[PDB]
Amino acid sequence: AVKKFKPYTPSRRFMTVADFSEITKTEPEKSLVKPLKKTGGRNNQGRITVRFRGGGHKRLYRIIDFKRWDKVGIPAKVAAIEYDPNRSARIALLHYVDGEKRYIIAPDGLQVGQQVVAGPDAPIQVGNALPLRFIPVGTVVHAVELEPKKGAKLARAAGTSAQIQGREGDYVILRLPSGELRKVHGECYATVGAVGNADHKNIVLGKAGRSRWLGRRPHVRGAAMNPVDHPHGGGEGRAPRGRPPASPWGWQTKGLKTRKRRKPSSRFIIAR
Amino acid sequence: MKRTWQPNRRKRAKTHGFRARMRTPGGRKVLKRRRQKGRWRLTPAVRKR
RNA sequence: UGGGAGAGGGUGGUGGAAUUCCCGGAGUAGCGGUGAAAUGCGCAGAUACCGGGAGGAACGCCGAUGGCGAAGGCAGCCAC
RNA sequence: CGAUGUCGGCUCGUCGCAUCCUGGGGCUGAAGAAGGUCCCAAGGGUUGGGCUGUUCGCCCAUUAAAGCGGCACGCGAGCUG
RNA sequence: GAAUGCCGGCAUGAGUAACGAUAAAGAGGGUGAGAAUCCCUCUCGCCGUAAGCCCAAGGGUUCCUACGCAAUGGUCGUCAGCGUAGGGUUAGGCGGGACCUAAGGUGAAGCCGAAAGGCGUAGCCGAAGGGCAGCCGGUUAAUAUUCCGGCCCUUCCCGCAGGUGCGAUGGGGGGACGCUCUAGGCUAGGGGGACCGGAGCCAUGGACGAGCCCGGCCAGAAGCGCAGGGUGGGAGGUAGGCAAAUCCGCCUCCCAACAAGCUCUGCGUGGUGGGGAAGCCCGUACGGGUGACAACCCCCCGAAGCCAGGGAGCCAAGAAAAGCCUCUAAGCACAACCUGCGGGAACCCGUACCGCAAACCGACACAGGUGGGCGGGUGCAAGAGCACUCAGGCGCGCGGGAGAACCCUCGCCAAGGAACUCUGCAAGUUGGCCCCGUAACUUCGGGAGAAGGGGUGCUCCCUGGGGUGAUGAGCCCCGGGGAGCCGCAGUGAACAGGCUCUGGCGACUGUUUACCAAAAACACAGCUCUCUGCGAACUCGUAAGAGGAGGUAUAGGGAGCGACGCUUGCCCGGUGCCGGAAGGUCAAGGGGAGGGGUGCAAGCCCCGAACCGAAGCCCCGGUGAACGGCGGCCGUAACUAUAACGGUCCUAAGGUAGCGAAAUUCCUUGUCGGGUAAGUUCCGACCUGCACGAAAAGCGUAACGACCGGAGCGCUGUCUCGGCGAGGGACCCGGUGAAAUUGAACUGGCCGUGAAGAUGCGGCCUACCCGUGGCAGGACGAAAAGACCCCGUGGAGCUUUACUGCAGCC
RNA sequence: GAGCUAGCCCUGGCCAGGGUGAAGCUGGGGUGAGACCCAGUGGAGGCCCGAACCGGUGGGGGAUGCAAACCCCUCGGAUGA
RNA sequence: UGGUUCGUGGAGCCAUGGGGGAAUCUGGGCGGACCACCGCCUAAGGCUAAGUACUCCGGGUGACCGAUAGCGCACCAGUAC
Ligand SMILES: [Mg+2]
Ligand SMILES: [Mg+2]
Ligand SMILES: [Mg+2]
Ligand SMILES: [Mg+2]
Ligand SMILES: [Mg+2]
Ligand SMILES: [Mg+2]
Ligand SMILES: [Mg+2]
Ligand SMILES: [Mg+2]
Ligand SMILES: [Mg+2]
Ligand SMILES: [Mg+2]
Ligand SMILES: [Mg+2]
Ligand SMILES: [Mg+2]
Ligand SMILES: [Mg+2]
Ligand SMILES: [Mg+2]
Ligand SMILES: [Mg+2]
Ligand SMILES: [Mg+2]
Ligand SMILES: [Mg+2]
Ligand SMILES: [Mg+2]
Ligand SMILES: [Mg+2]
Ligand SMILES: [Mg+2]
Ligand SMILES: [Mg+2]
Ligand SMILES: [Mg+2]
Ligand SMILES: [Mg+2]
Ligand SMILES: [Mg+2]
Ligand SMILES: [Mg+2]
Ligand SMILES: [Mg+2]
Ligand SMILES: [Mg+2]
Ligand SMILES: [Mg+2]
Ligand SMILES: [Mg+2]
Ligand SMILES: [Mg+2]
Ligand SMILES: [Mg+2]
Ligand SMILES: [Mg+2]
Ligand SMILES: [Mg+2]
Ligand SMILES: [Mg+2]
Ligand SMILES: [Mg+2]
Ligand SMILES: [Mg+2]
Ligand SMILES: [Mg+2]
Ligand SMILES: [Mg+2]
Ligand SMILES: [Mg+2]
Ligand SMILES: [Mg+2]
Ligand SMILES: [Mg+2]
Ligand SMILES: [Mg+2]
Ligand SMILES: [Mg+2]
Ligand SMILES: [Mg+2]
Ligand SMILES: [Mg+2]
Ligand SMILES: [Mg+2]
Ligand SMILES: [Mg+2]
Ligand SMILES: [Mg+2]
Ligand SMILES: [Mg+2]
Ligand SMILES: [Mg+2]
Ligand SMILES: [Mg+2]
Ligand SMILES: [Mg+2]
Ligand SMILES: [Mg+2]
Ligand SMILES: [Mg+2]
Ligand SMILES: [Mg+2]
Ligand SMILES: [Mg+2]
Ligand SMILES: [Mg+2]
Ligand SMILES: [Mg+2]
Ligand SMILES: [Mg+2]
Ligand SMILES: [Mg+2]
Ligand SMILES: [Mg+2]
Ligand SMILES: [Mg+2]
Ligand SMILES: [Mg+2]
Ligand SMILES: [Mg+2]
Ligand SMILES: [Mg+2]
Ligand SMILES: [Mg+2]
Ligand SMILES: [Mg+2]
Ligand SMILES: [Mg+2]
Ligand SMILES: [Mg+2]
Ligand SMILES: [Mg+2]
Ligand SMILES: [Mg+2]
Ligand SMILES: [Mg+2]
Ligand SMILES: [Mg+2]
Ligand SMILES: [Mg+2]
Ligand SMILES: [Mg+2]
Ligand SMILES: [Mg+2]
Ligand SMILES: [Mg+2]
Ligand SMILES: [Mg+2]
Ligand SMILES: [Mg+2]
Ligand SMILES: [Mg+2]
Ligand SMILES: [Mg+2]
Ligand SMILES: [Mg+2]
Ligand SMILES: [Mg+2]
Ligand SMILES: [Mg+2]
Ligand SMILES: [Mg+2]
Ligand SMILES: [Mg+2]
Ligand SMILES: [Mg+2]
Ligand SMILES: [Mg+2]
Ligand SMILES: [Mg+2]
Ligand SMILES: [Mg+2]
Ligand SMILES: [Mg+2]
Ligand SMILES: [Mg+2]
Ligand SMILES: [Mg+2]
Ligand SMILES: [Mg+2]
Ligand SMILES: [Mg+2]
Ligand SMILES: [Mg+2]
Ligand SMILES: [Mg+2]
Ligand SMILES: [Mg+2]
Ligand SMILES: [Mg+2]
Ligand SMILES: [Mg+2]
Ligand SMILES: [Mg+2]
Ligand SMILES: [Mg+2]
Ligand SMILES: [Mg+2]
Ligand SMILES: [Mg+2]
Ligand SMILES: [Mg+2]
Ligand SMILES: [Mg+2]
Ligand SMILES: [Mg+2]
Ligand SMILES: [Mg+2]
Ligand SMILES: [Mg+2]
Ligand SMILES: [Mg+2]
Ligand SMILES: [Mg+2]
Ligand SMILES: [Mg+2]
Ligand SMILES: [Mg+2]
Ligand SMILES: [Mg+2]
Ligand SMILES: [Mg+2]
Ligand SMILES: [Mg+2]
Ligand SMILES: [Mg+2]
Ligand SMILES: [Mg+2]
Ligand SMILES: [Mg+2]
Ligand SMILES: [Mg+2]
Ligand SMILES: [Mg+2]
Ligand SMILES: [Mg+2]
Ligand SMILES: [Mg+2]
Ligand SMILES: [Mg+2]
Ligand SMILES: [Mg+2]
Ligand SMILES: [Mg+2]
Ligand SMILES: [Mg+2]
Ligand SMILES: [Mg+2]
Ligand SMILES: [Mg+2]
Ligand SMILES: [Mg+2]
Ligand SMILES: [Mg+2]
Ligand SMILES: [Mg+2]
Ligand SMILES: [Mg+2]
Ligand SMILES: [Mg+2]
Ligand SMILES: [Mg+2]
Ligand SMILES: [Mg+2]
Ligand SMILES: [Mg+2]
Ligand SMILES: [Mg+2]
Ligand SMILES: [Mg+2]
Ligand SMILES: [Mg+2]
Ligand SMILES: [Mg+2]
Ligand SMILES: [Mg+2]
Ligand SMILES: [Mg+2]
Ligand SMILES: [Mg+2]
Ligand SMILES: [Mg+2]
Ligand SMILES: [Mg+2]
Ligand SMILES: [Mg+2]
Ligand SMILES: [Mg+2]
Ligand SMILES: [Mg+2]
Ligand SMILES: [Mg+2]
Ligand SMILES: [Mg+2]
Ligand SMILES: [Mg+2]
Ligand SMILES: [Mg+2]
Ligand SMILES: [Mg+2]
Ligand SMILES: [Mg+2]
Ligand SMILES: [Mg+2]
Ligand SMILES: [Mg+2]
Ligand SMILES: [Mg+2]
Ligand SMILES: [Mg+2]
Ligand SMILES: [Mg+2]
Ligand SMILES: [Mg+2]
Ligand SMILES: [Mg+2]
Ligand SMILES: [Mg+2]
Ligand SMILES: [Mg+2]
Ligand SMILES: [Mg+2]
Ligand SMILES: [Mg+2]
Ligand SMILES: [Mg+2]
Ligand SMILES: [Mg+2]
Ligand SMILES: [Mg+2]
Ligand SMILES: [Mg+2]
Ligand SMILES: [Mg+2]
Ligand SMILES: [Mg+2]
Ligand SMILES: [Mg+2]
Ligand SMILES: [Mg+2]
Ligand SMILES: [Mg+2]
Ligand SMILES: [Mg+2]
Ligand SMILES: [Mg+2]
Ligand SMILES: [Mg+2]
Ligand SMILES: [Mg+2]
Ligand SMILES: [Mg+2]
Ligand SMILES: [Mg+2]
Ligand SMILES: [Mg+2]
Ligand SMILES: [Mg+2]
Ligand SMILES: [Mg+2]
Ligand SMILES: [Mg+2]
Ligand SMILES: [Mg+2]
Ligand SMILES: [Mg+2]
Ligand SMILES: [Mg+2]
Ligand SMILES: [Mg+2]
Ligand SMILES: [Mg+2]
Ligand SMILES: [Mg+2]
Ligand SMILES: [Mg+2]
Ligand SMILES: [Mg+2]
Ligand SMILES: [Mg+2]
Ligand SMILES: [Mg+2]
Ligand SMILES: [Mg+2]
Ligand SMILES: [Mg+2]
Ligand SMILES: [Mg+2]
Ligand SMILES: [Mg+2]
Ligand SMILES: [Mg+2]
Ligand SMILES: [Mg+2]
Ligand SMILES: [Mg+2]
Ligand SMILES: [Mg+2]
Ligand SMILES: [Mg+2]
Ligand SMILES: [Mg+2]
Ligand SMILES: [Mg+2]
Ligand SMILES: [Mg+2]
Ligand SMILES: [Mg+2]
Ligand SMILES: [Mg+2]
Ligand SMILES: [Mg+2]
Ligand SMILES: [Mg+2]
Ligand SMILES: [Mg+2]
Ligand SMILES: [Mg+2]
Ligand SMILES: [Mg+2]
Ligand SMILES: [Mg+2]
Ligand SMILES: [Mg+2]
Ligand SMILES: [Mg+2]
Ligand SMILES: [Mg+2]
Ligand SMILES: [Mg+2]
Ligand SMILES: [Mg+2]
Ligand SMILES: [Mg+2]
Ligand SMILES: [Mg+2]
Ligand SMILES: [Mg+2]
Ligand SMILES: [Mg+2]
Ligand SMILES: [Mg+2]
Ligand SMILES: [Mg+2]
Ligand SMILES: [Mg+2]
Ligand SMILES: [Mg+2]
Ligand SMILES: [Mg+2]
Ligand SMILES: [Mg+2]
Ligand SMILES: [Mg+2]
Ligand SMILES: [Mg+2]
Ligand SMILES: [Mg+2]
Ligand SMILES: [Mg+2]
Ligand SMILES: [Mg+2]
Ligand SMILES: [Mg+2]
Ligand SMILES: [Mg+2]
Ligand SMILES: [Mg+2]
Ligand SMILES: [Mg+2]
Ligand SMILES: [Mg+2]
Ligand SMILES: [Mg+2]
Ligand SMILES: [Mg+2]
Ligand SMILES: [Mg+2]
């Protein structure tokens, strides 16, 4: 839906805030299962290796369930849907009949009080997790494992999904959110449905401060620098570059493909 | 204005102390040189308890 | 009250022909287009044919000089 | 070049005359008034503004006239910048 | 004898500058050999959300006392933060540690590294973060929440008494948290009083009066009373909380749905314990006596503090561990643990003093800097603002005169108001609150404090609301209405915007060249391109490993542009990039046709053609919000003129929209209009664009700007064109007393000359010796081994299709 | 060598007092249901004025200074990047 | 690739990182590409004084200095600062 503001200040005339009506009466999170101390830090053992990070709001990390084959057959009731600061999606807090409480990444259409389960059994319903093989060809799915028993790694951002295209021996063909055509092992678990919070792409940050709240420090152009700091540095009053556009470290940034050619993964990819 | 020397006993001891010098080979060489030179004080005197 | 007709509107599904593209087989001196031709594609192996895959669009005969709506308009079927 | 601060303005002037006006004067195509040119003569005086960093120039209103140049294109151990 | 030589000593300036904030001094009396400066008394001035108090870091004997002035103090000094000597720092409760954990560090296991060494789950260290039991008074010259007095607590150990299955570094709960706005009751604090307690006092015209002026509290167990914070209670089942678990979690039933009850805080009351002003008398460098059997009462304001884990809202979504409670396991149930009461034990370290400053950082008794808490009254609207002033602490460690020029700060001004000038630079106008009333434009919020006008004091009368008192008196806040009074002036003093039009640039809040540039530069939300399928790409690292990220295409990295509105056209010949199992060239390797060297020979050793050989380049294509670029000449219309039209040359293609003499336009003050009396500036247009142009984006854009340009109303010492006054210096006297510079000097002017600019050479002229206040013309004045220029086969920083290499990648 | 300085990480503290009054809610108007419009409440914002506090805009002074970056007036932000 | 005078040179010998990969006296290395003859050695295991280097320390001597010299210090100096 997206919240809008009146221009009672500049930067408030384009600012826009997400709709939190799907956040059930549960704003503060769950102890026990989560939170962990989350270690803010823009750098390695010493050196910054990803520029322009730092600042922004403190965050507690929600240690979510990305491998649902622990509770094969054990159903759970969706107790709540909460805001997760460490990801774009929302998170669903579910109570297993087992008594154990877990968070799943909250798919689109998930309602509070609804029944969800994981396993080869599992009715093909939104929220349920299955090995890819037993899911009907053509249904959309998310939180897809890459290799069996390694954890969900595909389609976890707000409003993303993958669609099952076909099967081929022990593998099923997925069309990933990028549009890549990928061979993924049949035994890989994935949970049916799309991610939801799909209005995430429609939010307008509004001002610089909002960028800072998310820990995103200002990004300065190479043109603004000096030849010591970027081959785009200098020269005189503005400059159109003078060479194929490059990163600070000298590699070209318009077209140069960079995935290594001889990767063993190559014989499982079909598209772009 | 604000000058460069802003004393701190913990900073002085943690930065120039005997144990800090002993922790690395470069500082052990510092203590070796000051000993051979006959320095009365191998490391800065940081006081208080 | 009792019945009748109808592409009335919508949501969710769902079918086949066909187009284009990708993959394999086997096949080679051109295809294409126009009043005439060229651009163009084709010796890096095309058009033609077969097998499978993908996606979008409208709905072939029925179909009518037919029907429905206030109008613009409304067409493969199913349920609500 | 092991130092001679460089345009323009302000302030302080001072010097040369090949004279902008004032005074003397020959000639005049000098009726008179006013002019032209010219010899002698610097004692003094030689406005306030608009434009522009401007020197210079163009204009507005005047005036007897709105002079040219030298003094490290005078003058920053005087000022500005 | 020289090296702007090195070390040391002494001159010069020169008794000159300065004596370190303009908050301020006068007198008198002590002491002393010596008093503007030390002591005491009075008069005066200054600070007072400090220039007063309390903590923290730092400092480290500066604290106190006694004896002293050679040196330190910008002078003096009998003085001190100085010298000599002595003394002073007392804790189970304050702070730190025999408590905990975070970043980070360290680090057994383990991983890596020529070596030194690097990462590294556990554990450990690691703190104004959590946990922890004390308040009030009195005493020293110096310590006190440490010593004493009163009252109150905390742990441990041993004993009896009563209870219970006790019971772990293990399981669970708890601790446990953001920003803004807040309700209820309290406290600190403050205002006050006809009430109480006081030594006193009627002055100078009046006042013996509810007169003046001072003070009217502090802490305090148990039990209480009020406000408040936390919490449901059971009965079954159980597969989860990595063993077990009566605990937790989860499902099903029942009573609560209440904060009733249970604990837990704070605040009043409280057995009881302390303090107790002004004034007067004393001798202190200060404190004591008395006032004192001191009184210790009632209202009002009321916090940002307490009840604090209270409530509500919002997105950007808000530490960890231990102490604490429960649960159980090995073990043990003669243990052990819980409760109550006794007796016993309770360590180590700091404790002085300064602490917005003469004790910390500044070489200095330096106008700079330094975290946190308290920080009173009055009045101006308010408030930590500003003016005065309690408590208190100061007069800034050279004075005295004078009344010059001149410098700085400040005040005023006739008449004119920007004529000054680069430019209203500066300064001046305006200025707080209440009430009316406001345009274009606009993104509908704004522009708005537009502009701009009126009121503002004081007395009396009537009168409406609230809060605390019971539905009332007092009291505390706000108003409304009506008459009057005074001055030039009523936010009367202090703090408290000048106004308007237009354009250029940037959307806007912001960031930046510490120490000359705060901008039109950077950033910014937003838009586009590209890379990247998770052991992701990219980055650091030899590696291990770490970031990316405990993230997964709505995610992450690079690049550019830069809100928003409207839009971003043609050229892929060249470069970059992307896609192309064809062909050409193409290294090592394979292959051996053939030939060579020795040998009596088998043999051994060499070269060595075809032929099979990758990536790359060539070649084929795509791709410009990738690198980039987007023409010329001649002719033609019936007034001339122009050329909608035509022809031709060439390129890969031959700038469309939109703007345009611009932040771009040389000629140029292009040309017309407008602003002026006058307009190389400014604005509106034409287009002949030397040399705009569409994401190094193009054209506009409300608002915004310590950005830049132009113009006007208002106001001025900016100017005609200056004058006067005040003060701190300058100046004279006493006192302490620098500096760079300096070949030596007994150092005139002119006209010449001299290395081309003479005090010193030539000729003439002028000129007694020597000082003081001063102006700057000169001594090519001082200060920097010229920073522009050139040179050196001098150095450094950058980029590239310069050379040759290296990391990295194929 | 990061006790100055730049960035970040962990944990603490601070921002007086005033104005403007977003969304949402309550009532009412209006419809078939709305949208929407009035009030009242409400306390939003890289909100406005402006002390502490963080700055350093313009001018004057200072230039062997109080100061090897200062001083006076003026100026910016001032719940947020 | 390194060492040797040896810098690819006719480039060996000695050591190696790397691919292949023997034998035990009629066995193997070498005599500077290579081959034949003729000669010298017996690798892939370790220990080995002396003669040789130096002067923190002690002693002796000086066509060595004599407080701006001589070690930075003749003196409580690697101190004061
Ligand atoms: Mg590391
Ligand atoms: Mg690092
Ligand atoms: Mg480190
Ligand atoms: Mg998470
Ligand atoms: Mg979410
Ligand atoms: Mg940027
Ligand atoms: Mg730059
Ligand atoms: Mg570069
Ligand atoms: Mg570069
Ligand atoms: Mg530059
Ligand atoms: Mg250029
Ligand atoms: Mg460039
Ligand atoms: Mg170029
Ligand atoms: Mg690709
Ligand atoms: Mg790369
Ligand atoms: Mg590749
Ligand atoms: Mg020169
Ligand atoms: Mg020379
Ligand atoms: Mg000289
Ligand atoms: Mg000179
Ligand atoms: Mg000179
Ligand atoms: Mg000149
Ligand atoms: Mg000049
Ligand atoms: Mg003449
Ligand atoms: Mg005449
Ligand atoms: Mg005449
Ligand atoms: Mg005449
Ligand atoms: Mg004449
Ligand atoms: Mg003359
Ligand atoms: Mg004359
Ligand atoms: Mg003028
Ligand atoms: Mg003018
Ligand atoms: Mg003249
Ligand atoms: Mg002259
Ligand atoms: Mg000249
Ligand atoms: Mg000139
Ligand atoms: Mg001149
Ligand atoms: Mg000057
Ligand atoms: Mg000058
Ligand atoms: Mg001069
Ligand atoms: Mg001067
Ligand atoms: Mg000499
Ligand atoms: Mg000499
Ligand atoms: Mg000589
Ligand atoms: Mg010298
Ligand atoms: Mg002297
Ligand atoms: Mg004197
Ligand atoms: Mg003098
Ligand atoms: Mg003098
Ligand atoms: Mg003097
Ligand atoms: Mg002074
Ligand atoms: Mg006296
Ligand atoms: Mg006396
Ligand atoms: Mg005596
Ligand atoms: Mg402390
Ligand atoms: Mg000190
Ligand atoms: Mg002392
Ligand atoms: Mg004494
Ligand atoms: Mg003394
Ligand atoms: Mg003295
Ligand atoms: Mg002094
Ligand atoms: Mg004394
Ligand atoms: Mg003292
Ligand atoms: Mg002393
Ligand atoms: Mg102990
Ligand atoms: Mg002990
Ligand atoms: Mg401890
Ligand atoms: Mg400990
Ligand atoms: Mg610990
Ligand atoms: Mg850790
Ligand atoms: Mg770390
Ligand atoms: Mg450790
Ligand atoms: Mg380590
Ligand atoms: Mg670690
Ligand atoms: Mg604490
Ligand atoms: Mg404690
Ligand atoms: Mg004391
Ligand atoms: Mg107590
Ligand atoms: Mg128990
Ligand atoms: Mg038990
Ligand atoms: Mg226990
Ligand atoms: Mg626990
Ligand atoms: Mg816990
Ligand atoms: Mg109240
Ligand atoms: Mg009280
Ligand atoms: Mg009170
Ligand atoms: Mg009172
Ligand atoms: Mg009172
Ligand atoms: Mg009495
Ligand atoms: Mg009387
Ligand atoms: Mg009185
Ligand atoms: Mg009273
Ligand atoms: Mg009580
Ligand atoms: Mg109660
Ligand atoms: Mg049970
Ligand atoms: Mg249970
Ligand atoms: Mg268990
Ligand atoms: Mg009480
Ligand atoms: Mg008393
Ligand atoms: Mg005293
Ligand atoms: Mg506070
Ligand atoms: Mg709460
Ligand atoms: Mg709360
Ligand atoms: Mg935790
Ligand atoms: Mg622990
Ligand atoms: Mg047991
Ligand atoms: Mg047992
Ligand atoms: Mg003490
Ligand atoms: Mg003390
Ligand atoms: Mg003090
Ligand atoms: Mg201060
Ligand atoms: Mg302070
Ligand atoms: Mg000071
Ligand atoms: Mg100091
Ligand atoms: Mg002083
Ligand atoms: Mg401060
Ligand atoms: Mg106060
Ligand atoms: Mg006050
Ligand atoms: Mg007062
Ligand atoms: Mg008041
Ligand atoms: Mg006010
Ligand atoms: Mg305060
Ligand atoms: Mg004040
Ligand atoms: Mg006082
Ligand atoms: Mg002084
Ligand atoms: Mg005045
Ligand atoms: Mg005047
Ligand atoms: Mg007047
Ligand atoms: Mg006027
Ligand atoms: Mg003018
Ligand atoms: Mg003038
Ligand atoms: Mg101007
Ligand atoms: Mg001004
Ligand atoms: Mg005024
Ligand atoms: Mg005012
Ligand atoms: Mg003003
Ligand atoms: Mg007024
Ligand atoms: Mg208007
Ligand atoms: Mg108008
Ligand atoms: Mg309207
Ligand atoms: Mg405007
Ligand atoms: Mg408005
Ligand atoms: Mg007004
Ligand atoms: Mg009442
Ligand atoms: Mg009342
Ligand atoms: Mg009046
Ligand atoms: Mg004032
Ligand atoms: Mg104002
Ligand atoms: Mg005005
Ligand atoms: Mg403007
Ligand atoms: Mg324009
Ligand atoms: Mg212009
Ligand atoms: Mg800006
Ligand atoms: Mg603002
Ligand atoms: Mg600067
Ligand atoms: Mg610096
Ligand atoms: Mg600097
Ligand atoms: Mg600099
Ligand atoms: Mg500046
Ligand atoms: Mg600025
Ligand atoms: Mg868009
Ligand atoms: Mg790397
Ligand atoms: Mg790594
Ligand atoms: Mg990683
Ligand atoms: Mg992570
Ligand atoms: Mg992205
Ligand atoms: Mg990016
Ligand atoms: Mg840009
Ligand atoms: Mg658009
Ligand atoms: Mg374009
Ligand atoms: Mg383009
Ligand atoms: Mg285009
Ligand atoms: Mg191309
Ligand atoms: Mg091209
Ligand atoms: Mg090419
Ligand atoms: Mg290619
Ligand atoms: Mg090839
Ligand atoms: Mg070959
Ligand atoms: Mg032969
Ligand atoms: Mg091509
Ligand atoms: Mg004609
Ligand atoms: Mg033509
Ligand atoms: Mg041609
Ligand atoms: Mg055009
Ligand atoms: Mg033009
Ligand atoms: Mg023009
Ligand atoms: Mg004209
Ligand atoms: Mg004109
Ligand atoms: Mg002008
Ligand atoms: Mg044209
Ligand atoms: Mg341009
Ligand atoms: Mg163009
Ligand atoms: Mg472009
Ligand atoms: Mg732009
Ligand atoms: Mg424009
Ligand atoms: Mg624009
Ligand atoms: Mg504009
Ligand atoms: Mg500005
Ligand atoms: Mg700004
Ligand atoms: Mg005006
Ligand atoms: Mg004046
Ligand atoms: Mg004047
Ligand atoms: Mg005159
Ligand atoms: Mg005066
Ligand atoms: Mg004197
Ligand atoms: Mg001469
Ligand atoms: Mg002579
Ligand atoms: Mg002479
Ligand atoms: Mg003199
Ligand atoms: Mg002078
Ligand atoms: Mg002179
Ligand atoms: Mg001279
Ligand atoms: Mg000179
Ligand atoms: Mg030099
Ligand atoms: Mg030199
Ligand atoms: Mg030079
Ligand atoms: Mg030059
Ligand atoms: Mg050369
Ligand atoms: Mg060179
Ligand atoms: Mg360098
Ligand atoms: Mg630092
Ligand atoms: Mg404070
Ligand atoms: Mg509203
Ligand atoms: Mg507000
Ligand atoms: Mg604001
Ligand atoms: Mg503002
Ligand atoms: Mg402000
Ligand atoms: Mg700043
Ligand atoms: Mg300041
Ligand atoms: Mg300033
Ligand atoms: Mg100045
Ligand atoms: Mg302002
Ligand atoms: Mg070699
Ligand atoms: Mg070799
Ligand atoms: Mg050779
Ligand atoms: Mg060789
Ligand atoms: Mg080998
Ligand atoms: Mg050998
Ligand atoms: Mg051989
Ligand atoms: Mg040989
Ligand atoms: Mg051996
Ligand atoms: Mg000597
Ligand atoms: Mg010596």
List keywords for this structure.
part of a larger assembly, 2 chains, A: mainly beta, 6-stranded antiparallel β-sheet, 4-stranded antiparallel β-sheet, globular, B: 49 residues, mainly alpha, 3 helices, binds magnesium ion, RNA-binding, ribosome, Frameshift
Q: Brief overview, please?
A:
It is classed as ribosome. This is part of a larger assembly, with chains A (272 residues) and B (49 residues). Helices cover 2% and strands 23% of the residues of chain A.
- By DSSP (H or I, 4+ residues per run), the number of helices of chain A equals 1
Overall helicity of chain B: 55-70%
Radius of gyration of chain B: 13 Å
Structural class of chain B: mainly alpha
Major pleated sheet of chain B: none
Rg result of chain A: 22 Å
- Oligomeric assembly: part of a larger assembly
What profile does the largest beta sheet of chain A have?
6 strands, antiparallel
If strands are numbered along the chain, what order do they take across the biggest sheet of chain A? 9-16-10-13-14-15
Please provide the count of β strands of chain A.
16
* Helix-strand pattern of chain B: HHH
Tell me the distance between the termini of chain B.
Answer: 31 Å
Classification by helices and strands of chain A: mainly beta
Overall body shape of chain B: elongated
Strand content of chain B: under 5%
How large a portion of the residues of chain A is in β-strands, by DSSP E? 15-25%
Distance between the termini of chain A: 32 Å
Region (Disordered) (chain A): 222-272
Family (chain A): Belongs to the universal ribosomal protein uL2 family.
Biased composition (Basic residues) (chain A): 256-272
Biased composition (Basic and acidic residues) (chain A): 229-239
